[PDB]
Design a protein around this ligand. Structure first.
Ligand code: FE
Length: 271
């Protein structure tokens, strides 16, 4: 078995039994083929993984924050496969390799397609190419079926908000790619190149999505401070009251197949 990860070639002979994953998308790929990771970087909060995944798999031991995992906690779990993020864990990758063979894959800031590609590479590295390939095809057809239930040209835009500000998830974000797969139009330019866009109130006005779905990280947030602005009423999502609060765990953090399906289900209930 061999894959190309974000550093080149990853090879494995034995079937890994104890897997430690450092992101939530990887928890999806393992759960899709009934593999329970023994360790997850869950930022010390298992509820950040959506319940549809944790129902498929055994409970895990937390190895700490996704941005800064505990190498000790990982090593104590005695894993034989570590699945890390290409963006978040470039610096600690070589330290992760000291513990066990480490696969460097993308999730944060990468497309819905690239997250599907990483699930395929995970299926190879664990020895379930055929089962993972079949699970991915059943997902692609499920979304193609949801693409028929939707018949609207309204623009939908997701973003996370906090006291710090608002970040619009562009078409090349995971949530943006999920919407494109469902045939939903995006209000942002087709050539937007960053997934999480720092969004000023003026930028929000220039975009003016018909639907603004927002995952709240802090109550209250910068959006409430923008409602103080009387210019806020010019927003289509404000006019039609189509500014809806959604789960940031589902739409931003989890970035998996089973979350894309719940997104298509949740998007259906809105329309
Ligand atoms: Fe984050």
């Amino acid at each position: 078995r061999s894959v190309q990860d974000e550093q080149g070639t990853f090879e494995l002979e034995a079937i890994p039994q104890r897997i430690v994953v450092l992101e939530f998308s990887f928890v999806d790929a393992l759960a899709a083929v009934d593999v329970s990771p023994v360790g997850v970087a869950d930022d010390n909060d298992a509820t950040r993984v959506i319940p549809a995944v944790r129902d498929k798999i055994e409970p895990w031991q937390s190895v700490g924050m996704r941005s800064q995992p505990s190498l000790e906690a990982i090593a104590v779990l005695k894993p034989d496969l570590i699945i890390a993020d290409a963006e978040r864990h470039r610096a600690i990758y070589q330290d992760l390799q000291r513990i066990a063979p480490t696969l460097l894959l993308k999730s944060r800031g990468e497309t819905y397609k690239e997250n599907l590609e990483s699930a395929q590479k995970i299926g190879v590295a664990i020895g379930k190419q055929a089962q993972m390939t079949q699970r991915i095809e059943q997902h692609k057809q499920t979304m193609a079926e949801f693409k028929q239930h939707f018949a609207t040209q309204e623009t939908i835009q997701f973003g996370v908000v906090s006291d710090k500000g608002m970040w619009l998830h562009s078409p090349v974000s995971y949530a943006g790619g999920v919407l494109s797969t469902l045939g939903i139009q995006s209000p942002l330019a087709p050539s937007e190149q960053k997934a999480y866009i720092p969004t000023s109130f003026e930028l929000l006005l220039k975009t003016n999505p018909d639907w603004l779905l927002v995952g709240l990280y802090s109550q209250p947030n910068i959006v409430d401070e923008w409602r103080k602005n009387p210019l806020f009423k010019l927003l289509t999502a404000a006019k039609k009251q189509q500014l809806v609060e959604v789960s940031p765990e589902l739409w931003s953090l989890n970035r998996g197949m089973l979350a894309a399906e719940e997104i298509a289900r949740n998007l259906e209930a809105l329309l």
